[PDB]
Amino acid sequence: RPRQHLLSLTRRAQKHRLRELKIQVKEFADKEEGGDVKAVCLTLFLLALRARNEHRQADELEAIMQGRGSGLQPAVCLAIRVNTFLSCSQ
Amino acid sequence: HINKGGRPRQHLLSLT
DNA sequence: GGTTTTTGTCTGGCTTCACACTTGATTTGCATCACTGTG
DNA sequence: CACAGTGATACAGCCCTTAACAAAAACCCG
DNA sequence: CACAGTGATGCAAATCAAGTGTGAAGCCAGACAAAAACC
DNA sequence: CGGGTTTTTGTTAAGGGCTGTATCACTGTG
């Protein structure tokens, strides 16, 4: 049977394409980086995303992995509401 | 073996 | 039938999230009020 | 020399690949 | 029976902060074992 | 004290793609 799309695969049915890769991934992480796998994959994914010209997604991932800056201050929300010529209902 | 020196290896998340 | 893919399981051990009770202490949502503006 | 718009358009800035080389900072040991 | 505002007010609904011990869920180990679409 | 080794950062040019800003003749309260 021909293979299907990788994203459409379930959580369990996608480990047998990555079994033959995580071995060298983690041995490289041990021998060169120190042992971290999530961090080195973060670096690789940021590099791939920036090469693909998806800097918006790269910045979103950087923000979510770093301290979450989500949420605007009430003062700046009021500043936007007043300077952008907006009304309360809008 | 003799140590040849070199710059220390920082965390991969701390580089450019 | 062959071949490849796709799900299923196996037990001990680990981490990670939800809740079981209670009492307040807030934050947030939405209806109400008499009006406008284009004729 | 009022000052903050008003929106479509075009050009500049910043950044990614190729690959080989160059300038520069941190330890080791004679 | 126009309809989308217009913002302040006030009450009701929702979420949470405080205490620790549980349950409930996802995943890890490497390996074995059934369904399903093309020849 | 300074080569020697290792690691960090930048540089050269041809193209592609996203993002930011200047430019054009106008507006209104008079």
Side-chain angles (χ1 to χ4, degrees), chain A residues 1-2 4-67 69-90, chain B:
Chain A
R1 199 164 69 201
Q4 263 71 64
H5 198 266
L6 59 89
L7 205 44
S8 48
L9 269 175
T10 57
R11 310 168 166 200
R12 161 161 310 274
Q14 62 186 354
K15 194 153 178 304
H16 39 90
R17 312 310 71 81
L18 314 181
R19 208 161 184 182
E20 51 206 289
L21 282 72
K22 73 173 188 290
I23 189 66
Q24 71 272 17
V25 159
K26 64 182 181 293
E27 68 91 23
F28 174 79
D30 292 330
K31 87 154 84 168
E32 284 295 312
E33 309 301 319
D36 47 350
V37 176
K38 184 255 299 181
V40 306
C41 185
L42 188 147
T43 71
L44 172 63
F45 192 49
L46 264 68
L47 287 179
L49 280 195
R50 274 181 281 111
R52 188 67 270 173
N53 268 339
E54 274 167 22
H55 302 57
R56 190 261 305 278
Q57 283 84 320
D59 291 330
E60 286 281 348
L61 183 62
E62 201 281 308
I64 192 167
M65 294 299 291
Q66 216 189 4
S70 189
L72 266 185
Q73 318 276 358
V76 65
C77 295
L78 180 76
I80 278 171
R81 207 219 72 184
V82 183
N83 189 179
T84 63
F85 274 140
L86 265 182
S87 69
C88 291
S89 305
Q90 308 288 33
Chain B
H1 195 252
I2 51 183
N3 194 9
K4 326 203 82 175
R7 203 195 285 238
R9 286 164 170 261
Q10 304 106 299
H11 207 264
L12 194 54
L13 305 176
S14 88
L15 272 298
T16 59

